[PDB]
């Protein structure tokens, strides 16, 4: 089923971009 | 591998670094990224990659470099290349642009399909001349597409959006949002199963009308209805039991374990394959009877192409085309573009089926024209 | 033959149908008008029955 | 031999035409110009009967205006209750094709007839509660088209062999026969006093038959095509005929010529069933083009329309008290219509 | 009133029993196919009656498929009124012989009158042409019985898509497919009717006739369902 | 009353010429497809030729195809048949017949024994002597 794979990919992408933005902010510091 | 687990692991690592500095040259500290121990002067101190990173299994041998000078002060520069995600983030931004555009696209498509299926269902229900078994299974198919649209919209709306902008720690667990997400996910999977199962039911019913010798279809109509609603429960309920017992997440949308997703993809692809075989046999019978008449050389091929375009959205033949594609090929960038066309076809399939079976149909136009003629005769 | 017998039967039938008493059109038409005018009130289709007395309502 | 008989027949027909021209005193429309018109008649469907599978060919009301018998081509004869839409009786038929049905004025007997050339009379006096063939009647060679009860012992029957018959139900033989037609005798209508009756046939002429004497008194030749239906005006003095040329014609017995022609330019389809109202002011004609029309019998204007059938209207019937109008069509539905105010 | 309630309850019970009987008869009525065996006259249709009152009924089942075939017996020759009662049959089996007054032309006019009827537009006609051996003996005799009656037979060639039976005079085959093309021209010239014609050449004694009727009725039913599903 | 009156015929020579008229009274002439029936001495009825309402659809029996000429006149209310180059096998009784239903293409029982709308007919003898 295509759309479930789509939603799973979007959720994984959101988790990954939240992780990258969190690591970026931590590197920035302050 | 969620965001709330990331905040919890970061808070646990911060508490561990605070306890390490309380239990404990360049004075090591917590600079919000990794915990630095006491460092000897004039040395390139190395820290391990911290365990709260989601990709720590791949960078477990990496080291963060930082220079400690001879005066006891930390250096300004810091090297963190060995803990970096190798995949470039700008392509992820293009992916987010693609995902947002396609999601607005199928949102508008599901809204238009929902309105058109509402109108078609009201037209079929209202008129008393059109109460036929064929129109009964069209009503069941339209109801299943309508429940599909409603379930997907509810699942999309009730899903909790990530919160990176918040920054500060928040209660990731919700006693309402997560339960609504699980309920909408179960209803969405049941409606997808009902959609494909009623496509199978209508394919088997047309196969029974064409091929079988003349046995009465009134007696075993209940079997078609029972198969149509029984099969989604049949493969959804063990999926719910496996998602409860083995792999439980905040929502059941992420397919971390593929084996739980094979029992969803198997009764759908089996259904699509059986509908494709019935599609082949119906086209063979129709080609034989249409070739038998032989009006003109261009007209029979033109009517065959017209009937093929008429019959492909009925049985899900385009879903065959996306069936061979492996996960290895899916990892390729081209699949992101391919998903847009596939979701476009799937989302507008309900609209095309509704329009073809309501507006295009001559009998429905006749009935509506007669009813409008009676209304204009009553008004005038 | 049968044809001459059929023709004689037709001639005898026309002789039977010819010597009949005939009334003028206006008198019988006025009688039909009088019947329609006299029985106009009792007719349920010409004069519609109220909903209480109507069994189909 | 043939020449003198044909010339004598032509002279007698010219004498009858000259007598009809001389007796033409006035015109019915010219003296009914000073009549208030009926106006628009809007009738609504009160009940809808859905028991038959095959097309419904004929119906007949009861004398209590309560029960109605309907015949279908699948071999089913259903006695309906008109108020509660309940099927009082369902009767299987020996012959699949039925072209006529009738209900006795006493209420005990129900007749049917079709292509089997046999009129089957069923009795409802059975103590078991099951219907049975009370008597079959087989004396016609052509197909059976119309039958109506005089009483429990006699029945007038129309067939397609250019003959009509009066049968004694007790003995089972024809009491008398009527031989005056050159075409298929489509329908008959009994007078209210049951002294005379009329027969409409495919020879574009209607006959006034006498029961006791056995010969036809009056012959009416005013139609162009086959006459399908016939019915009496409620006094017994006039009668209306519908034909395949999309024209109804109201004939008079004492004037011995046609009174009125009901025709419209846009209507080109045939006529299947005509029937008057209780008073006789409204003529209810079931046409072939999927609807019925309510004509004013005095003004010759379409007072109403009854477009409620998907398929052509086969039969039409009016109750004796005039309360409701039931139309049976070939879409396996019975529509009961009544006026509202 | 308790008496009205008791009478209404008994009437509802009788209505439920009659509805159960009608639902038991509905599958029996809708499963069974109906055939009208109609012939122009002395065509040997009694052979079809033996192999395959006013009306005669023949009951035969093939592969648990029930057929009622109705032969018109003692009826008047004026056909224009009762034939409408055969609008709802599954097929009209029109059987005429290819071999006093000319019979082929009256057969063509009768087939044209059946075909161009507005109520018979839905009903399809299966065509049978009997007496092929008598037609073959008539052609081999040398007497002109189709050039005199039909002038188009002189300027006529045998069709290429036609499959001739081996062991026959090609003049006999030419006359057979000439009559077949006459019936196809009469059936084709209308066009507006939603029905199809099935020509079949049959000898005096044949076995395959029931199989041909079964295949043609299955074709009519499948074309009707494809027409209802708008594929045709 | 629907009546049809035939006129013309009699004794003719083989290969000669003849004209037949059919007067129609009692109906609207322009709305009915009409046709011709012949009866040979010692034979039954058979169809000859027809004409539609407007006069476009014209068909013949193939034994006389190309030899006869049918023509209707709605204003003068008369059907006409022109017959030239006759044969001795064409001696018959001729019947001007009308199809029973208006506004239809089909004619069911024109060639029937006791059809009620055909005319009385005329005698044509094409004997050589
Ligand atoms: C009948 C069907 C074919 C109509 C389809 C209309 C589609 C093609 C149109 C209508 C609405 C449009 C969207 C409207 C708004 C946005 C937000 C913008 O930031 C990106 C483009 C995007 C996402 C558009 C993409 C194209 C779009 C989805
Ligand atoms: C979320 C899921 C469980 C909702 C399921 C709703 C089901 C139980 C309801 C909704 C639509 C309903 C159908 C609506 C229309 C018809 C056609 C009628 O002639 C037979 C009943 C039938 C077939 C109904 C059966 C029950 C039905 C299928
Ligand atoms: C017609 C609609 C309302 C039917 C919805 C069925 C809902 C109410 C039922 C069916 C399956 C059930 C779920 C089964 C499993 C779980 C996992 C458990 O850890 C939390 C409760 C939860 C999430 C249940 C909540 C209620 C639930 C979602
Ligand atoms: C939950 C899913 C897997 C249930 C699927 C049920 C399938 C496998 C069953 C149910 C109805 C069955 C069909 C019923 C009738 C016919 C017609 C026969 O001439 C060929 C087999 C065929 C086509 C059957 C094939 C198998 C079938 C399609
Ligand atoms: C009983 C009904 C629900 C059908 C159930 C089908 C199940 C039992 C079958 C169909 C698809 C199969 C899966 C197909 C592919 C794989 C990947 C392989 O590397 C491990 C086994 C695994 C994961 C299979 C496990 C068993 C499986 C899930
Ligand atoms: C598959 C969908 C998406 C596109 C369909 C393309 C059409 C035009 C092509 C591709 C597959 C082809 C069919 C393949 C198999 C058969 C069975 C054979 O006995 C008759 C021809 C027939 C029926 C072909 C007709 C034309 C066809 C249907
Ligand atoms: C993006 C939109 C435009 C896609 C629309 C696809 C459908 C609805 C369109 C595309 C092809 C169209 C068909 C093209 C040709 C014909 C033949 C004509 O005699 C009847 C209409 C009919 C059958 C059209 C119906 C509507 C149709 C099927
Ligand atoms: C996914 O990121 C969805 C966000 C978007 N605003 C929407 O469609 O709701």
Short mmCIF file of C-alpha atoms in Angstrom, two decimals, chain A residues 1-23 26-27 29-30, chain B residues 1 3 7 10 32 52 55 78 80 85 92-93 96 99 103 106 110 148 152 155 192 253-255 261 335 343:
data_model
loop_
_atom_site.label_atom_id
_atom_site.label_comp_id
_atom_site.label_asym_id
_atom_site.label_seq_id
_atom_site.Cartn_x
_atom_site.Cartn_y
_atom_site.Cartn_z
CA UNK A 1 0.00 0.00 0.00
CA UNK A 2 1.57 3.20 -1.35
CA UNK A 3 0.10 5.91 0.87
CA UNK A 4 1.01 4.18 4.11
CA UNK A 5 4.60 4.02 2.86
CA UNK A 6 4.29 7.74 2.00
CA UNK A 7 3.07 8.61 5.52
CA UNK A 8 5.82 6.44 7.05
CA UNK A 9 8.45 8.22 4.93
CA UNK A 10 7.05 11.61 5.97
CA UNK A 11 7.13 10.65 9.67
CA UNK A 12 10.70 9.33 9.33
CA UNK A 13 11.69 12.52 7.49
CA UNK A 14 10.14 14.69 10.22
CA UNK A 15 11.98 12.75 12.95
CA UNK A 16 15.25 13.04 10.99
CA UNK A 17 14.93 16.78 10.31
CA UNK A 18 13.99 17.38 13.96
CA UNK A 19 17.14 15.44 14.88
CA UNK A 20 19.31 17.46 12.46
CA UNK A 21 17.86 20.81 13.61
CA UNK A 22 18.32 19.74 17.25
CA UNK A 23 21.97 18.76 16.66
CA UNK A 26 23.21 22.24 20.08
CA UNK A 27 26.35 22.84 17.99
CA UNK A 29 25.12 26.64 21.60
CA UNK A 30 24.08 29.44 23.90
CA UNK B 1 13.61 6.80 16.83
CA UNK B 3 11.65 13.20 18.59
CA UNK B 7 14.62 14.81 23.97
CA UNK B 10 19.37 14.28 25.54
CA UNK B 32 25.18 21.44 25.11
CA UNK B 52 21.83 10.24 22.25
CA UNK B 55 22.85 7.56 13.98
CA UNK B 78 35.97 22.20 17.32
CA UNK B 80 32.78 17.23 14.67
CA UNK B 85 25.22 12.40 9.06
CA UNK B 92 16.09 16.91 2.43
CA UNK B 93 14.77 20.47 2.00
CA UNK B 96 10.14 18.56 2.15
CA UNK B 99 6.14 16.29 0.29
CA UNK B 103 0.19 16.55 0.36
CA UNK B 106 -3.99 14.90 -2.49
CA UNK B 110 -9.65 13.95 -1.52
CA UNK B 148 -11.43 5.81 2.85
CA UNK B 152 -7.36 9.41 5.67
CA UNK B 155 -5.64 10.45 10.28
CA UNK B 192 -8.00 0.68 2.64
CA UNK B 253 2.31 4.81 10.91
CA UNK B 254 6.05 4.03 10.89
CA UNK B 255 7.06 0.68 9.38
CA UNK B 261 3.98 -4.64 6.81
CA UNK B 335 10.71 6.96 -6.44
CA UNK B 343 -0.82 9.12 -5.15
#
